[PDB]
């Protein structure tokens, strides 16, 4: 499928941007704004951020499959969200260009109703959010210390942070070989109305970030998942995967072993029809499932990942496209699972982590 217009080299981390006029790839000329250019580029591609950045010299590094340079308008950069809008072709005489080490995500490092037991390392971003010893929600690692989950996982009775734990790196709930860390803060969306009024039926903005008290080490069993790239659309009909330890049947018990299930994305036109959810699928929400039912997420899966794989970055990567949010029962025909549309919260995520980088406690954020 069509490649993303912003790319990063796996060989030396050089940033490469597509020039639609030539159909070529160009390097980014080094400037005093390298730090932010690197950051924006990583965010644009679906990575959480740039860990570090550096300069490369074409005279010793080569062009490696590029034809020329792009220069960043450092006057327009501060007031833009899209890198492509502030770049123009330039000579870049000294031949120094930008390299950026974005935080790797979405790749395995190994050598739910109607789903099946999964195996270690297959979904290394999946975490279990437990309160006072009970698994209540899933979550997805965006880094070693930040987890994306659902805001509804934090009702009034589950807000004492010292009583929450994040279990990673294992698929069996009772495994003593995983890692379980504490929680420093929970940044929930201020637009999630039921947070202040549990009786509210308006579930839009069901999303929250969990900052662990310390970072988890990245291993073959613990890895962050990527985010949709800027402008990357959710494709109707595409089959993605949802995972979790939730009930294996609505009236059944939670899974002892993490479950995985494949479900296709359903269009809003169909899902908002009377036979389905009857105008209940609001903006920033989407359905995934089968008209026949049988395979779906369920209670205990909320906050968990709905991931789709793609190769737009020149290598297969899994991206967090939805967050398990709600549904009417579980696995019922014409009552698919409803998910928070992650792409609609990209900026909310990037800014929340920046604004509340070291905050503590429950924090609201619009």
């Amino acid at each position: 499928e069509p490649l993303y217009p912003v790319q990063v080299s796996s060989a030396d981390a050089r940033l490469m941007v597509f020039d639609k006029t030539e159909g070529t790839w160009r390097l980014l000329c080094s400037s005093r704004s390298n730090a932010r250019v690197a950051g924006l580029s990583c965010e644009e591609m679906g990575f959480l951020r740039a860990l570090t950045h550096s300069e490369l010299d074409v005279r010793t590094a080569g062009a490696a499959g590029t034809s020329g340079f792009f220069c960043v308008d450092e006057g327009r950069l501060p007031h833009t969200q899209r890198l492509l809008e502030v770049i123009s072709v330039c000579d870049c005489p000294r031949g120094r260009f930008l390299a950026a080490i974005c935080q790797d995500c979405g790749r395995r490092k190994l050598p739910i109703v109607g789903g099946r037991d999964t195996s270690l390392g297959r979904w290394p971003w999946q975490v279990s959010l437990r309160y006072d010893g009970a698994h209540l929600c899933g979550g997805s690692l965006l880094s070693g210390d930040w987890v994306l989950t659902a805001a509804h996982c934090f009702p009034e009775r589950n807000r004492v942070l010292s009583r929450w734990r994040v279990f990673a790196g294992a698929v069996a709930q009772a495994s003593p070989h995983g890692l379980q860390l504490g929680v420093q803060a929970v940044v929930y969306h201020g637009g999630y109305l039921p947070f202040r009024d549990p009786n509210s039926e308006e579930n839009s903005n069901d999303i929250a970030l969990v900052h662990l008290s310390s970072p988890l080490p990245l291993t073959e069993y613990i890895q962050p998942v990527c985010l949709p790239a800027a402008g990357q659309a959710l494709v109707d009909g595409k089959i993605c995967t949802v995972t979790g330890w939730g009930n294996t049947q609505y009236y059944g018990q939670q899974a002892g072993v993490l479950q995985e299930a494949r479900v296709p994305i359903i269009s809003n036109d169909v899902c908002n029809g009377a036979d389905f959810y009857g105008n209940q699928i609001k903006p920033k929400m989407f359905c995934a499932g089968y008209p026949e039912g049988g395979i779906d997420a369920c209670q205990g899966d909320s906050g968990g990942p709905f991931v789709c794989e793609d190769s737009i970055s020149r290598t297969p990567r899994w991206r967090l496209c939805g967050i398990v949010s709600w549904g009417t029962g579980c696995a019922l025909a014409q009552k698919p699972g409803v998910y928070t549309k992650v792409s609609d919260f990209r900026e909310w995520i990037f800014q929340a982590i920046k604004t509340h980088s070291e905050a503590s406690g429950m924090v609201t954020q619009l």
Binding site: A150, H152, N203, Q280, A297, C298, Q299, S302, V324, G327
Partner: peptide
């Protein structure tokens, strides 16, 4: 319409 039940939350998960």
């Amino acid at each position: 319409k039940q939350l998960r």
